[PDB]
Amino acid sequence: MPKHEFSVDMTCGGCAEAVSRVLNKLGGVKYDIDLPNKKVCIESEHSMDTLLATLKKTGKTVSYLGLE
């Protein structure tokens, strides 16, 4: 399974929670948030570039940072 790690500018809990609703627009995604570490850890059969573009709808510094 493709457990990939992404970091996003979670300057706020509302500013973070937005990542849930944009990933739900794809729907076919599994994910888990770490609010202190600023991480979303994802697994889906969709591409890393689809996930990255979807997270960047939330208006932030988003960086893909490798594999678990």
Binding site: T11, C12, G14, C15, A18, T58, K60
Partner: protein
């Protein structure tokens, strides 16, 4: 023709920088003229141009996030 305006109860925005995310995403929709957001009164106010913007387009720009926006001027 000239300035139009509306208020949107963004019922999912209150804390620190969900607030800031509005001003990032709205301020780059070409027809916007002035954005304001209220964090404790939990709502979003804007002045916009009618040739380039609409209340419907505002509701699309909040849908880039995850906030519970309803039109309420």
């Amino acid at each position: 023709m000239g300035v139009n305006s509306v208020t949107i109860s963004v019922e999912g925005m209150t804390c620190n920088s969900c607030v800031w995310t509005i001003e990032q995403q709205i301020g780059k929709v070409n027809g916007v003229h002035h954005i304001k957001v209220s964090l404790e009164e939990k709502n979003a106010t804007i002045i916009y141009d009618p040739k380039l913007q609409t209340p419907k387009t505002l509701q699309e720009a909040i849908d880039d996030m995850g906030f519970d926006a309803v039109i309420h001027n």
